[PDB]
Design a protein around this ligand. Structure first.
Ligand SMILES: O=S([O-])[O-]
Ligand SMILES: [Ca+2]
Length: 362
């Protein structure tokens, strides 16, 4: 059945003169840039490629869930697949602009869980431009081609919803080490510091090297060495997760590709988990570290750290030249421009805001 048995990744070199043989899907997405990928798939895209929207096609936000990219209802996703000719006449070839980690492997995961044939391009769109692949622009007004029969499974396979995760399942976490190892305050998109207890961190960036102006995969032995840091040969029963179930898909993909098995996905991931179990999570943080923070702004980990020699903080909404020792302690964890509500083990609650730039007279 499958075009490339055992594979999920493919270099441009393996596909460049065999393009027509795939249904190509542009899964470009950015966590921060508004309408990215729809803006970028217009400027330029691989010829004959249609586009998948991480937010609206590959997931469906629910009001009753903090999950950031939960699986969409399967019937809705399959409907969308058929409408776009992704129903098994050709194998799907997915790409994004972070080597599969940021949209591509997610689509791959979904198609594969249904029993369909799909692959991801090593190196993404950048390694498509930089390999001389045929390009097109704007909205193509030619050939989608709807399918009317569905030969594949009807429900996504080999994934656990939160309550289905066995109590002592081995869980990995694809998020950056900074996020994983966060104590009293979160970074990037996370609302809660920490991770699922017992989880093993396998930062997905570890498998990637920035050849050109985009990441490509590190070598196979390098990726195998990466994967081995969370083992201790068949990881099919591990539960792979991240912040919202997107980056975890490359960890599952690389494991699959290298022949090491096919781990469960926990799609809801930390965004879901930390929302559902917010109370006990906050109590352990307060217990372990003396305080827990809830951000009132986006996190600004790349901004300058708060420095009380050059800055006066706004505490509970007023400039505060006399910050007591607790506030001063909390502020060592904050950055220029951030605001956070801090819950101290004492029962004390304070809001602290750091000025965007040094603001002390002297
Ligand atoms: O994609 S982030 O939310 O893990
Ligand atoms: Ca501890």
């Amino acid at each position: 059945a499958p075009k490339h048995p055992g594979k999920v990744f493919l270099d441009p070199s393996e596909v460049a003169d065999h393009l027509a043989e795939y249904r190509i899907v542009d899964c470009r997405y950015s966590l921060k840039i508004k309408d990215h990928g729809s803006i970028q798939y217009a400027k330029e895209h691989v010829k004959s490629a249609i586009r998948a929207d991480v937010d609206t096609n590959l997931s469906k936000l629910v009001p009753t869930s903090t999950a950031r990219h939960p699986l969409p209802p399967c019937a809705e996703f399959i409907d969308w697949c058929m409408a776009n000719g992704m129903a098994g006449e050709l194998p799907v070839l997915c790409y994004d602009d972070e080597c599969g980690a940021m949209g591509g492997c997610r689509l791959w995961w979904m198609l594969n869980s249904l029993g369909a044939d799909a692959y991801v391009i090593n190196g993404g769109f950048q390694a498509c431009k930089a390999a001389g692949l045929e390009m097109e622009s704007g909205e193509p007004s030619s050939l989608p081609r709807p399918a009317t029969h569905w030969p594949f499974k009807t429900a996504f396979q080999h994934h656990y919803l939160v309550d289905e995760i066995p109590p002592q399942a081995i869980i990995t976490d694809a998020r950056s080490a900074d996020r994983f190892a966060s104590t009293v305050r979160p970074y990037a998109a996370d609302k809660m510091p920490g991770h699922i207890e017992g989880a093993r961190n396998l930062p997905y960036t570890s498998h990637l090297v920035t050849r050109g102006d985009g990441k490509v995969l590190r070598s196979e032995e390098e990726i195998r060495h990466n994967i081995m840091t969370v083992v201790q040969a068949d990881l099919s029963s591990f539960v792979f997760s991240c912040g919202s179930g997107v980056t975890a898909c490359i960890n599952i993909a690389l494991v699959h590709h290298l022949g090491l098995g096919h781990p469960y996905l926990y799609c809801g991931s930390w965004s879901e988990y930390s929302g559902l179990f917010r109370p006990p999570i906050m109590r352990s943080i307060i217990d372990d570290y003396g305080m827990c923070m809830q951000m009132q702004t986006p996190s600004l980990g790349d901004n300058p750290k708060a420095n009380l020699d050059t800055m006066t903080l706004k505490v509970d909404g007023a400039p505060c030249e006399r910050p007591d020792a607790e506030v001063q302690s909390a502020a060592t964890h904050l950055h220029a421009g951030e605001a956070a509500t801090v819950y101290f083990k004492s029962g004390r609650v304070v809001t602290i805001e750091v000025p965007v730039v040094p603001n002390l007279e002297a």
